Amino acid sequence: AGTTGERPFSDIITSVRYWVIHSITIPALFIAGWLFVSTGLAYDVFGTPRPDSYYAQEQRSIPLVTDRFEAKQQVETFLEQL
Amino acid sequence: AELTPEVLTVPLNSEGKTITLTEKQYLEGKRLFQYACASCHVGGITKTNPSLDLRTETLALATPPRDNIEGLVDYMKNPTTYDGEQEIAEVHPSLRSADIFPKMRNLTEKDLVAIAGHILVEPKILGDKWGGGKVYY
Amino acid sequence: GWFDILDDWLKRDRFVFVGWSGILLFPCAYLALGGWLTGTTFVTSWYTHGLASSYLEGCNFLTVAVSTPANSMGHSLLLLWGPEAQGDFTRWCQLGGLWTFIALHGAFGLIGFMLRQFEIARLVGVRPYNAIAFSAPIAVFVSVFLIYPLGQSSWFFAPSFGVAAIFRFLLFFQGFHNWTLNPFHMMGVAGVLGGALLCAIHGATVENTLFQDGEGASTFRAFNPTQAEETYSMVTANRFWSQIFGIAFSNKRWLHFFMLFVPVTGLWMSAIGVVGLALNLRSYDFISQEIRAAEDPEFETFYTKNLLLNEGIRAWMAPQDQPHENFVFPEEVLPRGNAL
Amino acid sequence: METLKITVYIVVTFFVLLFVFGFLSGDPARNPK
Amino acid sequence: RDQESSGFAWWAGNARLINLSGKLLGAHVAHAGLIVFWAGAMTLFELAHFIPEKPMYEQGLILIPHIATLGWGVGPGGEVVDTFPFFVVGVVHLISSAVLGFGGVYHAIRGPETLEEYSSFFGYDWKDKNKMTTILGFHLIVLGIGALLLVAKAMFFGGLYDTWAPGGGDVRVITNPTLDPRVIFGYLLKSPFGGEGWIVSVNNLEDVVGGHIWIGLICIAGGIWHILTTPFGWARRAFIWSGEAYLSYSLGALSMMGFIATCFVWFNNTVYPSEFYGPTGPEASQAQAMTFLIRDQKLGANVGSAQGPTGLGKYLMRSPTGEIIFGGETMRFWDFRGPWLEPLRGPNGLDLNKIKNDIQPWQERRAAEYMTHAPLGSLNSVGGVATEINSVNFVSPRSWLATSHFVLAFFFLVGHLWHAGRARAAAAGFEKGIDRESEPVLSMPSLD
Amino acid sequence: NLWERFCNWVTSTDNRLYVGWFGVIMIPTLLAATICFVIAFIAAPPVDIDGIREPVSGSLLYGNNIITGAVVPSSNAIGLHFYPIWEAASLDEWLYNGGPYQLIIFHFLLGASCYMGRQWELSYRLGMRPWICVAYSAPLASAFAVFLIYPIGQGSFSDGMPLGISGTFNFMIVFQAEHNILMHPFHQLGVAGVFGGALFCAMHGSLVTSSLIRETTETESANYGYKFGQEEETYNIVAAHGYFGRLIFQYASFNNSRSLHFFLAAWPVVGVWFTALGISTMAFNLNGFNFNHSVIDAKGNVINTWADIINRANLGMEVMHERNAHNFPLDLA
Amino acid sequence: YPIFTVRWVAVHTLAVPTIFFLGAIAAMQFIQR
Numbered sequence A: 001a002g003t004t005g006e007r008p009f010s011d012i013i014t015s016v017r018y019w020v021i022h023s024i025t026i027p028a029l030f031i032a033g034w035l036f037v038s039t040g041l042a043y044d045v046f047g048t049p050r051p052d053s054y055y056a057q058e059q060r061s062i063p064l065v066t067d068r069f070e071a072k073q074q075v076e077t078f079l080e081q082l
Numbered sequence B: 001a002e003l004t005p006e007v008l009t010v011p012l013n014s015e016g017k018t019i020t021l022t023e024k025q026y027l028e029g030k031r032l033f034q035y036a037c038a039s040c041h042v043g044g045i046t047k048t049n050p051s052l053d054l055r056t057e058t059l060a061l062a063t064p065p066r067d068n069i070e071g072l073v074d075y076m077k078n079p080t081t082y083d084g085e086q087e088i089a090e091v092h093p094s095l096r097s098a099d100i101f102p103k104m105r106n107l108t109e110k111d112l113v114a115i116a117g118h119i120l121v122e123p124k125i126l127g128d129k130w131g132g133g134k135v136y137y
Numbered sequence C: 001g002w003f004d005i006l007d008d009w010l011k012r013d014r015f016v017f018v019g020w021s022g023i024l025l026f027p028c029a030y031l032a033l034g035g036w037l038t039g040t041t042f043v044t045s046w047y048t049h050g051l052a053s054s055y056l057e058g059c060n061f062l063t064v065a066v067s068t069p070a071n072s073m074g075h076s077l078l079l080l081w082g083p084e085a086q087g088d089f090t091r092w093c094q095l096g097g098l099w100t101f102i103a104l105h106g107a108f109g110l111i112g113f114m115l116r117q118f119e120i121a122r123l124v125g126v127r128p129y130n131a132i133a134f135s136a137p138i139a140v141f142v143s144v145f146l147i148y149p150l151g152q153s154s155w156f157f158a159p160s161f162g163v164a165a166i167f168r169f170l171l172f173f174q175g176f177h178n179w180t181l182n183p184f185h186m187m188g189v190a191g192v193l194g195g196a197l198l199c200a201i202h203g204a205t206v207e208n209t210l211f212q213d214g215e216g217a218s219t220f221r222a223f224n225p226t227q228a229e230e231t232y233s234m235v236t237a238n239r240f241w242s243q244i245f246g247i248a249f250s251n252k253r254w255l256h257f258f259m260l261f262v263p264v265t266g267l268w269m270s271a272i273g274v275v276g277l278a279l280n281l282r283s284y285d286f287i288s289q290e291i292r293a294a295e296d297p298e299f300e301t302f303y304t305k306n307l308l309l310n311e312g313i314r315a316w317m318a319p320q321d322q323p324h325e326n327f328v329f330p331e332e333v334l335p336r337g338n339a340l
Numbered sequence D: 001m002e003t004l005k006i007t008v009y010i011v012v013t014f015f016v017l018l019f020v021f022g023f024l025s026g027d028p029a030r031n032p033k
Numbered sequence E: 001r002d003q004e005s006s007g008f009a010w011w012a013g014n015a016r017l018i019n020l021s022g023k024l025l026g027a028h029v030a031h032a033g034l035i036v037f038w039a040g041a042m043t044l045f046e047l048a049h050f051i052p053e054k055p056m057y058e059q060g061l062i063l064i065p066h067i068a069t070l071g072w073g074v075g076p077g078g079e080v081v082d083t084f085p086f087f088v089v090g091v092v093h094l095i096s097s098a099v100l101g102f103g104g105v106y107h108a109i110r111g112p113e114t115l116e117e118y119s120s121f122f123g124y125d126w127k128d129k130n131k132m133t134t135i136l137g138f139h140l141i142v143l144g145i146g147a148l149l150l151v152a153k154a155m156f157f158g159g160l161y162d163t164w165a166p167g168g169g170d171v172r173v174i175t176n177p178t179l180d181p182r183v184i185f186g187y188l189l190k191s192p193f194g195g196e197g198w199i200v201s202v203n204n205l206e207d208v209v210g211g212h213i214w215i216g217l218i219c220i221a222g223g224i225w226h227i228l229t230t231p232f233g234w235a236r237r238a239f240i241w242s243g244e245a246y247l248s249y250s251l252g253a254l255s256m257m258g259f260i261a262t263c264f265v266w267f268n269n270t271v272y273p274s275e276f277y278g279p280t281g282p283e284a285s286q287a288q289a290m291t292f293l294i295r296d297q298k299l300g301a302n303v304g305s306a307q308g309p310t311g312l313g314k315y316l317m318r319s320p321t322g323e324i325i326f327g328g329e330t331m332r333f334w335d336f337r338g339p340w341l342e343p344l345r346g347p348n349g350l351d352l353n354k355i356k357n358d359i360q361p362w363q364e365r366r367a368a369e370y371m372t373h374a375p376l377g378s379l380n381s382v383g384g385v386a387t388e389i390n391s392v393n394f395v396s397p398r399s400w401l402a403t404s405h406f407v408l409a410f411f412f413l414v415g416h417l418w419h420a421g422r423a424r425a426a427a428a429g430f431e432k433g434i435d436r437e438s439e440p441v442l443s444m445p446s447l448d
Numbered sequence F: 001n002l003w004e005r006f007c008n009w010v011t012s013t014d015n016r017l018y019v020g021w022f023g024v025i026m027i028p029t030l031l032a033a034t035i036c037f038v039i040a041f042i043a044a045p046p047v048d049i050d051g052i053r054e055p056v057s058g059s060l061l062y063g064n065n066i067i068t069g070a071v072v073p074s075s076n077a078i079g080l081h082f083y084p085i086w087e088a089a090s091l092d093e094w095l096y097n098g099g100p101y102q103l104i105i106f107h108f109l110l111g112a113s114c115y116m117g118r119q120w121e122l123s124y125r126l127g128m129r130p131w132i133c134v135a136y137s138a139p140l141a142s143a144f145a146v147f148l149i150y151p152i153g154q155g156s157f158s159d160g161m162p163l164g165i166s167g168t169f170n171f172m173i174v175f176q177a178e179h180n181i182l183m184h185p186f187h188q189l190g191v192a193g194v195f196g197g198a199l200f201c202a203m204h205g206s207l208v209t210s211s212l213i214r215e216t217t218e219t220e221s222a223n224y225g226y227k228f229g230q231e232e233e234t235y236n237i238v239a240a241h242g243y244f245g246r247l248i249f250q251y252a253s254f255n256n257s258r259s260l261h262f263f264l265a266a267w268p269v270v271g272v273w274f275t276a277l278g279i280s281t282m283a284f285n286l287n288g289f290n291f292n293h294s295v296i297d298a299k300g301n302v303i304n305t306w307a308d309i310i311n312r313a314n315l316g317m318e319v320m321h322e323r324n325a326h327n328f329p330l331d332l333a
Numbered sequence G: 001y002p003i004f005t006v007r008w009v010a011v012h013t014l015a016v017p018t019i020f021f022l023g024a025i026a027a028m029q030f031i032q033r
């Protein structure tokens, strides 16, 4: 097989400089992901309904899209009646 | 949609008096229902007798009326037939027969109110799903 | 020339080969994978299906999915800048724009990968039979995720990218299409199961006809990639199956060609059948037996039994599986056996 | 039916006895080496 | 301890212990400790999660029912009266594990790697047919004594729990065990199919105790036999005599016993009391037909003349041999016997007069209970059929015990096939492949 | 030395088809099951499988084709009871109650089990390694699961897989409605085993064919570049590994043919082993994952998932399967 | 050895978002209705 030329993964993940850098970068990305949910930013970015944002106080009728081109406003008018 | 106090507000007796349960009280009545009722009463039906369900409309036409907290707690102490002609504690779990139904032993008076409440609150949330059967699954 | 300079860089011997096909493959494939991971983690399906389908909503790995666009969208491309989303990323996700995003980028990803197979095979110096074989997964993807919903009313009836969603797709095709009764799926089954048989029986035979080229009990060390000799006895393997099964392989080249043929042919056959289902052209019934059964209430086969099951599946799942139809079935119209 | 039962029972026994006595007849020795 | 000097890779590293009696002994004692450890650890675990007023089969218990079956910590009806014997069993097994582990580790990494040049008594060679049978004889006597411990427990030390006890289930002392060979060895000659059920159909503790007396004596006698004798000529020519070979012999045995234990825990409700393990499959189905028979009869239905949709009796029908049985799908389960159903059994099966008149409330409760506790549940422990909604957290211990051991039984059969075939090949001399300059087929004539 | 002559012919390696001691049992049983199957598939009268006096036609002469034809399982009235011919008052009764089904599968399971043992036997006679039979244990366990193990756990051979194409489909559909086999991690491993098997089969087949060393021209088959029993390998694994090692990355490819071929055996066998155990464990009603009404909103409304849609489909099979066999609300048997 | 290569990018394009996503789902386990 030989080796292509890049630095072997084995020696990198066993190097100190690597874990000096990645003992900060990896947890930060983890925390960043945590904050993306705990702040509730994920809900507003993707438009995913919160546990209290599926129905109104007295409806079981599914807010289903029935139109094609006016579908955007049809979803927006669903968000309004909440 | 949330668990508002008006949803948790259930009739107390048979003369109009009501009571608003708390959210934790409902979660307790849910946990206790799964503990000693769910085996025969999943979803408000009755596996060993599908002719009778835990629907509010059904409980109201029972004798004595069971569409309130006072009625259900009494049933959990001294259960009777739908017409109340005979007592059936010998074949139905109750405080009166907690010797042959051991799961009813550690149930306090507070525990009975929560269960009674959950039975009344649930159809106000699930609608006809409560006591409906596999059709409404 | 700049073309020749770029060609050198693209075809550099690396840990991960790129090539000209990489310009198409890598970005499309990354977006298809990323789009699915994004949708199954955050994006819902509440406005398209009336379903939860992300970890954020409480779904697990088996139940999460990127669901198909609403039926009212038709066969729309649902581009982000399209007339439906109108540049709004949030609305785009809520309408099912990520499904077409994955399906389309995933399609050109598969094209890029098959091209990658051609490209590398040309540089190495081997025949392109690996690329040829990969035409079967592509034919499957195209027929099922593209052609079938195109034949139907909308993208809605295409498979949703999810584990349980696929299981829905399976049972749907039983209740509505009677897909099991279709001979083109049957040939596909024979190809897949037959492929697994060939895969198991070849590896087992080779491993149990090995020559002794070492002193160790673990024979894996007794092989070298640059050796010129066969590592197992074709002669001994031939006599064995000749006496056990009656027939046996005598030609290694035909053996490994056949191992290509069986599962590839099967998938292509199942692909053809799906194309038919796109037009509701099903192998649903046998007219001869329907005539008999309708005239004779004492005639019953396993075929007539399965149709009763399909009738049950349809009437019981349709209102929720097709919420755009606004189906309302009173209990008394539901097909039910006794007691149950 | 009684005749059939006896017949099958004898047939089965015959073959089973062949299997037992057969493998008891020095089967490990029956190998190329 | 490497592939270069062993021949075996790391994933087959335990195969390096074949010719190392010392380390191998430590491995078998250390693993033995692991078994006793789990026994004690899981027992204390169940006890800490145990709720007395709840049935054992609603709390996911498998060890406590085993103890309770031995008549420890239970009373009339199988109700728990003392949790302390459960505690003792857990502690003692847990304490003993530390001992076995101590010697297991010692013999493995500190003890002599070979026992042959240390002690001729404990040293053994696989080829030594006389030594092997002696060790076989020893452990045989060990198993014989263990079976007599159950006998002693049942006859002298409190007895066992009898679900068939008069006036309801209770702990009873076995006074007259069945020694009649026509009964004991009668089970071994019964058919494994429906209505017969082989040894699984033992339905009284008298037979269970009497059986273990026979096994207790047979193993001791057989143990003495294999010590004072050496394998006969026909035996020496019929078997493969090596370490891996003996392993495959035991693997086949354990696989067989595994399948047997599965069917036993699924069908038998005598040594697996339904009070502890929950109702069996047949039992729960029978209990359902019982429940609606009672309910409908109260409403005024005539269950004897009630015609079902198919013409068959809706509540009562006949078995292929004529016996009066419950109607519906449960017709298949007409061979079911239970202490709650037998009171309604007559000489021709279910007696209609006892049904109309002599049904007692405790039978109605028992039927409804077992009906609503059928061994049906999902992998994430959701009670009921697959179409059921989330509410009841229940999967019967019978389902857990039957499935788990069937898996183990099957893989041990695979283990039998693997280690047996290789033992044959290794003894013959081609387990590592075919000799290139001496291929057997090349010396054989053509098939055509 | 007369019985020795018989033993030598039985264990003979010069027979066109190896007999062996396993074959001494295999040949009669397989012939018995086969002959009965062919006759029953063609000319057998209807069979009351559900034991409710509702006979199900399965043979060609009674209105079936190849697709709808089947040998129908024994009656539910029989259950797990052993039902040979001599236990019936007449062949007419025996046929009405699904007699042929038990006769075939029992002779078949015995024959098939001996078939596996027969595979070890010849390999021992030839000086081979004996684990090919272990690979055959994967489909054999699968057959044991649907023919023997599942009827045991359910309590009737009427719930065994019918000997027919449509009957097979009936077995699958009813199974899903009662066990949710799709949401079971063992069937999913089985799917991964057979999809992966087919993938790897197509994969191994394509890579070896691609790396074939030129020994022929364009006017003849490439297969003639290989001669039976030749010393040299017909392809170049070095080139093949060079290709697949660049298709992904080199450490995701096999350079060891023995290690590669072992993987080819391991993956689908292990996969089928699990799906075999899947049926075997679901036989004792340890069913697939149940996530019905798992997602709930703040108020308490059930927010459906794809699992709930699967449930609705399962409800449809459940309430319709064996429409006349149920008298009570819970399906236990 | 080179530090930043094509392989480097190929890694972090899968690496970085994965840990970010894992942290997100980790926070979702504490969401109550």
Ligand code: CLA
Residues within 6 Å of the ligand: C023, C024, C025, C027, C028, C031, C077, C078, C079, C080, C081, C097, C098, C100, C101, C102, C104, C105, C108
């Ligand atoms: C290999 C690269 C590649 C490919 C083949 C695709 C392919 C696709 N993407 Mg994807 N995409 C890519 C990379 C790629 N993408 C990247 C890297 C990103 C991240 C930045 C995205 C982000 C992305 C999004 C956000 C969306 C798509 C979508 C699409 C689809 C619609 C594209 C379209 O209409 O283009 C039209 C444009 C062209 C075909 C280019 C034409 C170029 C020629 C030379 C004409 C030049 C004209 C000249 C300059 C004059 C300009 C106009 C002037 C007169 C005013 C299609 C399946 C859409 C989708 O899936 O919707 C469901 C969508 O919304 N992609």
Ligand code: CLA
Residues within 6 Å of the ligand: E010, E011, E012, E013, E014, E015, E244, E247, E251, E411, E412, E413, E414, E415, E416, E418, E419, E422
């Ligand atoms: C009593 C049981 C027993 C014993 C004492 C042995 C002993 C031996 N076996 Mg055998 N074997 C057994 C049962 C047994 N086997 C069974 C039941 C099977 C069928 C599955 C096999 C299949 C088998 C094979 C295929 C091979 C052996 C071999 C061996 C040898 C080496 C074993 C080794 O190093 O394993 C090392 C152990 C491991 C690498 C660990 C395996 C872990 C498994 C795969 C998963 C366990 C999952 C766990 C239960 C649950 C999940 C936990 C996880 C999530 C943390 C040794 C002579 C080898 C041989 O022939 O040597 C001469 C060999 O190749 N055995």
Ligand code: CLA
Residues within 6 Å of the ligand: E001, E002, E009, E010, E011, E012, E013, E014, E015, E016, E017, E020, E023, E024, E026, E027, E028, E030, E031, E098, E101, E102, E105, E108, E109
């Ligand atoms: C049931 C499990 C089990 C057991 C009992 C053994 C036992 C043994 N193995 Mg095996 N092995 C196992 C599983 C097991 N193995 C599995 C699953 C694998 C696959 C990975 C292997 C792979 C393997 C290989 C590759 C080799 C062995 C070898 C050995 C032997 C020497 C080990 C040694 O020198 O360790 C040295 C390790 C240490 C000194 C570290 C400490 C070890 C101790 C035991 C830890 C004890 C911890 C415990 C909590 C202490 C309790 C104390 C008490 C007072 C309470 C030993 C008899 C060797 C052999 O055959 O040699 C001839 C060998 O080469 N095994």
Ligand code: CLA
Residues within 6 Å of the ligand: E025, E029, E099, E100, E101, E102, E103, E104, E106, E107, E111, E112, E115, E119, E122
């Ligand atoms: C399977 C069990 C077993 C076996 C076969 C052996 C065998 C051996 N051990 Mg080991 N050992 C074991 C378990 C075992 N040990 C355990 C569990 C421990 C932990 C306590 C030890 C601790 C240990 C030590 C510390 C030493 C040995 C040594 C020895 C050697 C000499 C033993 C001797 O002369 O005993 C002669 C007999 C006696 C001293 C009297 C024994 C009385 C017994 C234990 C009474 C109880 C019997 C009862 C039936 C047990 C039931 C157990 C239950 C789990 C069923 C020999 C190789 C020695 C050695 O190798 O030195 C170089 C040594 O130093 N062993």
Ligand code: CLA
Residues within 6 Å of the ligand: D020, E133, E136, E140, E188, E189, E218, E219, E220, E221, E222, E223, E225, E226, E229, E230, E231, E232, E235
């Ligand atoms: C753990 C138990 C065990 C084990 C492993 C062994 C192992 C051995 N014994 Mg020992 N033996 C045991 C217990 C055991 N024995 C006990 C407890 C007794 C007292 C009864 C004896 C009495 C005994 C005698 C008298 C002899 C042996 C002999 C042998 C050797 C040959 C066995 C043989 O050929 O079996 C294979 C068995 C057969 C070929 C029998 C025929 C096949 C039948 C029909 C199988 C039916 C199986 C089927 C599933 C049905 C089972 C259920 C039911 C109907 C029976 C071997 C070393 C022989 C020897 O050489 O001793 C020195 C010998 O003559 N044993």
Ligand SMILES: CCCCCCCCCCCCCCCC(=O)OC[C@H](COP(=O)(O)OC[C@@H](O)CO)OC(=O)CCCCCCCCCCCCCCC
Residues within 6 Å of the ligand: C203, C204, C207, C208, C217, C218, C219, C220, E007, E008, E009, E011, E012, E015, E431, F131, F132, F134, F135, F189, F262, F265, F266, F269, F270
């Ligand atoms: C040790 C664990 C064993 C697990 C069960 C066995 C699985 C592999 C064997 C399948 C048999 C196929 C038919 C015969 C195929 C055949 O003939 O193989 C032949 C192959 C060649 O080995 P050798 O003959 O050189 O060595 C055999 C012995 O003599 C030991 O050296 O055997 C092995 O490689 C054994 C590998 C053991 C380790 C395998 C572990 C794989 C499973 C790991 C866990 C997976 C869980 C997945 C869950 C999703």
Ligand SMILES: CC1=C(/C=C/C(C)=C/C=C/C(C)=C/C=C/C=C(C)/C=C/C=C(C)/C=C/C2=C(C)CCCC2(C)C)C(C)(C)CCC1
Residues within 6 Å of the ligand: C030, C031, C033, C034, C035, C037, C038, G013, G014, G017, G018, G021, G022
């Ligand atoms: C959409 C879109 C886009 C894209 C984005 C992306 C591309 C993203 C990505 C993302 C990502 C890329 C993510 C990832 C994730 C990952 C994950 C989340 C993972 C996980 C894993 C796990 C969970 C594991 C598991 C396991 C296994 C499998 C093995 C065995 C065992 C265990 C269990 C450990 C853009 C902006 C361009 C544009 C607009 C649109």
Ligand SMILES: CC1=C(/C=C/C(C)=C/C=C/C(C)=C/C=C/C=C(C)/C=C/C=C(C)/C=C/C2=C(C)CCCC2(C)C)C(C)(C)CCC1
Residues within 6 Å of the ligand: E026, E027, E030, E031, E033, E034, E037, E091, E094, E095, E097, E098, E099, E100, E101, E102, E104, E105, E108
């Ligand atoms: C050989 C070998 C091995 C193995 C080993 C082993 C397996 C060991 C074991 C060991 C063991 C097996 C151990 C055991 C231990 C135990 C213990 C140590 C116990 C203790 C107990 C206690 C401490 C108790 C306490 C208590 C009491 C007293 C009462 C109750 C409660 C409590 C808890 C408080 C391995 C593979 C790793 C590797 C190397 C080789």
Ligand SMILES: CC1=C(/C=C/C(C)=C/C=C/C(C)=C/C=C/C=C(C)/C=C/C=C(C)/C=C/C2=C(C)CCCC2(C)C)C(C)(C)CCC1
Residues within 6 Å of the ligand: D019, D020, D021, D023, D024, E183, E184, E185, E187, E188, E199, E202, E207, E208, E209, E210, E211, E212, E214, E215, E238
């Ligand atoms: C305790 C008890 C009891 C009893 C039991 C008993 C008494 C048992 C016995 C058992 C027995 C007494 C068993 C036996 C068995 C036998 C066997 C298991 C055999 C085997 C054999 C073999 C395995 C062979 C093989 C072969 C062949 C086939 C040919 C040649 C070659 C060879 C050798 C390989 C009862 C039930 C009453 C009750 C419950 C409790």
Ligand code: OEX
Residues within 6 Å of the ligand: E329, F050, F076, F154, F158, F159, F174, F178, F321, F322, F325, F331, F332, F333
């Ligand atoms: O038979 Mn044939 O499938 Ca077994 O589950 Mn119950 O039974 Mn009837 O329903 Mn569903």
Ligand SMILES: [Cl-]
Residues within 6 Å of the ligand: E327, E328, E329, E330, F325, F326, F327, F328
């Ligand atoms: Cl029924």
Ligand SMILES: [Cl-]
Residues within 6 Å of the ligand: C305, F170, F174, F320, F321, F322, F323
């Ligand atoms: Cl059906």
Ligand SMILES: [Fe+3]
Residues within 6 Å of the ligand: C202, C206, C256, F204, F208, F261
């Ligand atoms: Fe190959």
